[model samples]
Target: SYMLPHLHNGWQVDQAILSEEDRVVVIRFGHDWDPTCMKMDEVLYSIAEKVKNFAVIYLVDITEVPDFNKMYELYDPCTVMFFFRNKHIMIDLGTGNNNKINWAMEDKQEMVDIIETVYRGARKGRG
Candidate 1:
């Protein structure tokens, strides 16, 4: 199932990555035991369906990719929701919270809304 220490699309959570470019990148992190994290997966993949060219990564931690975390300087438990255009620009699209998420039973529409909203906000110079 969706868990860390595994690979999806032929790329390990830590082994997979996108080259530096003006593209939006979304990284979702959570333990497999977490129900909220499980819900996030459904939502994120739903958004991925619409946002072509978007690079998504699932990381247990930076340590999974050797020194990758040190190379990028990322250390956090909360899902690091941000976009990258040559470099990472933190944007607060407000999609993260332990709230009443609408996507129950894998409803992706809410995820799409958040992704699109954040993406549009990024285009508007929020990132």
Candidate 2:
């Protein structure tokens, strides 16, 4: 895989990735005004705590990441989680497809449940 520090998208990452040696990456278009985003934040932090093995979470503001409009349109207002294995696509969540089912805004437990599934799916080579 590739390891690059400080991604240069339209927005600045809360913290530079510096290194993602062996972590899945999560990119979120979070709007402070958006209720959905707020809801997701709560669940995600919890998921982050438990699913540390699967990700290195990154939050980006839509106002800042203008280039992210395409991704926003692709997934709508939903938060997007991109799971990668050595730069190969392991799982893509939040796109409008059957795969979207794997990403959600249900409850704390369900969020972790979905994450767990993705973790399992990743190891199984089919997400």
Candidate 3:
């Protein structure tokens, strides 16, 4: 029932990043049926419309788009990555992993804050 767009292939993922020149590109890499992903997707969908002006969020199933699996090392159940201007944006969540968010974020407001933070940072070319 989520309204977020899904990137089914490597080309689509590439295009999503390439096409978004003005806003932050948020991509969630995981299986739709996974519990972790279900929770994360819930938060993503909740904030989709709110962050629409500053960010464009998309969902990608790792198993379906295995091309990026090895490149991104997407072994976790849920991984959220940010990109801007065709470049990957690194976020330090104090998890020692700056590449992507490797776990589920339960709070909707918290997720919005992070997305807003990333958008602000991306605008300044900080990430």
Candidate 4:
């Protein structure tokens, strides 16, 4: 089971997103019923120890609410986003929705790469 509610409510979401002074917050948003979320979590679990120093991984079941939930904030069923110093880090390039992705990581290394990329940039700029 990919177990649900790594965060109990939206308030925790706010805390987890902002409280970390350095570690990147990686949150995968979707239904626990979605196997893709499970797959993501498996990848997340595998990567946790490897990125332990730079990131912390957690899951938020969108199905849990707009109910104290952010079910509405989700744009896709199994979406993933990265955060650093509480900012919602977008994956952008040629100026578009090239970030906040889902499938860029079927494997742990890809996820690792993305988080590393975000951390390097997020930590550099003063915000």
Candidate 5:
């Protein structure tokens, strides 16, 4: 529903994560038209400016970048993954699924907190 910078292919996605020497690379992988993704994108777009210093957010269509589907196990309608210094950042959301966030978060503040937490952890090489 809203506009956000997107990665059109696997190569672009790879570069987005690898090229960012600082800040967490947050990526939302899913269909642009999916309702769940739309909802999540709203939250993401809301905080884009707030987290710009510590994090970079990018959207990726599952169909366009299938390269990470297997490696990241992206099968949900929307999945949010964090990366720092070319390494994947595992987030323990207490869902027992630390790999990725596979659901939509409607709260913009909560999303900001998560991004800040990830950024803090990532900076210390703990994520």
Candidate 6:
């Protein structure tokens, strides 16, 4: 409720990813009220401030902006993907198609570890 920069349209979505030059642009796509999404939003929210310097989190709803449904093939309950400098960064804690986490991270520490791993890799890749 305090900091979900919730993107309303495809244009803003594009801007969030493309304009993220310094830190990882994290976007969790799912219907906001879904039970699965609710858990992860909390996990992500807990990961918020500590990882704030390396990443930016934006929780999104698929219904409001269905533009990426066909584009990103977001057909699951909760999908979290990371991007940096327009580069798509792969995550390693989920068992779903593509680089996105196609499920909810039940706890904050599990999610936190992922962010640290992602941040290091994303930062290492910068050229």
Model 6, 1-127: lDDT tens digits are 5565678677888787876655687876678678777777777666777767777777777778756456667556667777877876666333333444565643676676677777766775644
Q: Rate the local accuracy (lDDT) of all candidates.
A: 0.46, 0.52, 0.69, 0.61, 0.68, 0.68
Residues 82-105 of candidate 1: C-alpha lDDT, one tens digit per residue? 545534555432344543332223
Model 5 residue 2 CA deviation in Å? 6.1
At residue 1, give the lDDT of candidate 4: 38
Q: In terms of lDDT, which candidate is stronger, 3 or 6?
A: 3
Per-candidate RMSD, Å: 6.9, 7.2, 3.9, 4.8, 4.2, 3.6
**Pairs of residues at least 3 apart in sequence or in different chains that clash in candidate 4:** 91-99
Instruction: Name the better of 3 and 4 by TM-score.
Output: 3
lDDT of 3 by residue, 1-127 (tens): 4477778876787787888856778776678777767767777667778767777877777778755454657656666677887887765222332444566644576676676677776785555
Q: Candidate 1: which pairs clash?
A: none
lDDT of candidate 5 over 80-122, digit per residue (tens) = 6778878876652212324445665445766666766776767
- What are the clashing pairs of model 5? none
* Alpha-carbon runs more than 4 Å astray in model 6: 68-74, 92-100, 124-127
lDDT of 2 by residue, 1-127 (tens): 1221113364344233334444566665545466766666666666675666556666555565554465445445545555455343434333333554233446675556656666555553453
Give the TM-scores of the predictions, in the order they appear. 0.49, 0.58, 0.77, 0.71, 0.76, 0.77
- lDDT for 11 in candidate 5 is 77
By TM-score, the candidates rank as: 3, 6, 5, 4, 2, 1
If both were scored by lDDT, which would come out higher, candidate 4 or candidate 5? 5
Candidate with the larger TM-score of 2 and 5: 5
Off by over 4 Å in 5: 1-3, 68-75, 92-100, 125-127
Which 10 successive residues of model 2 have the least lDDT summed?
1-10
> Candidate 6 local accuracy as lDDT?
0.68
Off by over 4 Å in 2: 1-19, 68-75, 86-104, 123-127
